[PDB]
Amino acid sequence: RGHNFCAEGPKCGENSECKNWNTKATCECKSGYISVQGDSAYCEDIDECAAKMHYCHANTVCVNLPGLYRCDCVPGYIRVDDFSCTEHDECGSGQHNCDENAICTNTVQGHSCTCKPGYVGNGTICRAE
Amino acid sequence: PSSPPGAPSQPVVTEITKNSITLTWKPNPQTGAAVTSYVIEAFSPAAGNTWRTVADGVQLETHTVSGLQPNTIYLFLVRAVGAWGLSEPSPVSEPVRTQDSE
Ligand SMILES: *[C@@H]1O[C@H](CO)[C@@H](O)[C@H](O)[C@H]1NC(C)=O
Numbered sequence A: 001r002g003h004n005f006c007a008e009g010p011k012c013g014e015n016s017e018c019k020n021w022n023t024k025a026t027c028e029c030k031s032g033y034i035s036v037q038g039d040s041a042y043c044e045d046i047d048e049c050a051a052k053m054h055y056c057h058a059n060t061v062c063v064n065l066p067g068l069y070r071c072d073c074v075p076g077y078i079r080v081d082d083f084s085c086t087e088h089d090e091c092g093s094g095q096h097n098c099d100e101n102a103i104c105t106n107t108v109q110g111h112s113c114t115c116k117p118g119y120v121g122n123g124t125i126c127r128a129e
Numbered sequence B: 001p002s003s004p005p006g007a008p009s010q011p012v013v014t015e016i017t018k019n020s021i022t023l024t025w026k027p028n029p030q031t032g033a034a035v036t037s038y039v040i041e042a043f044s045p046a047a048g049n050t051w052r053t054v055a056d057g058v059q060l061e062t063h064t065v066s067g068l069q070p071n072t073i074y075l076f077l078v079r080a081v082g083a084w085g086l087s088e089p090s091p092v093s094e095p096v097r098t099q100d101s102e
């Protein structure tokens, strides 16, 4: 192997990782962390829930985490994806008129109906190709 | 300007195996926030009623989603990531089925 530049002494800070390159050690922030003031040896957690941030989307409450974050549903809402929730499970309640061979997917606005592969139509009606 | 990037274009399936699907898309053409990576989400009517995040930190506009089930329907969407968060979703891809395992 090459020379262990990282073992020569302290270099990178608490939320930073030391890497041995051919001629020197280098520091990189851990995932989800960012340099405090332009030096990747010293990093702090990214606050994805800070003001003006838009990691989390409709009907969620952003929860900041060290190296991560989470988008919880507003109480009473049901999840669409990691970033958004919706008021009702329209697909699971029969609140839809999807064709028997269309896929029902909840959306923030309501739901979509998509004809399964091999079928053509607008999801309300599907016909084999 | 403290907004996320614009939504990418509809992802297109370019190759299929029995456990993977390869996707391609484009960044939003409208002038806006810079894109630093992409997030890929997958839906299957046989895998639960939420979208699963299947890839993140994607630097390119093409990527292969592996670890999938044979003979299964999948749909896909992409979000663009920037300094201030995530774009709204791209349009959903046309549904495809992975190949069967014979
Ligand atoms: C689908 O087509 C039917 C008639 O063919 C129409 O009544 C219905 O509104 C359409 N649905 C959508 C979402 O366009």
Ligand SMILES: [Ca+2]
Pocket (backbone or CB within 6 Å): A032, A045, A046, A047, A048, A064, A065, A066, A067, A068, A069
């Ligand atoms: Ca964080």
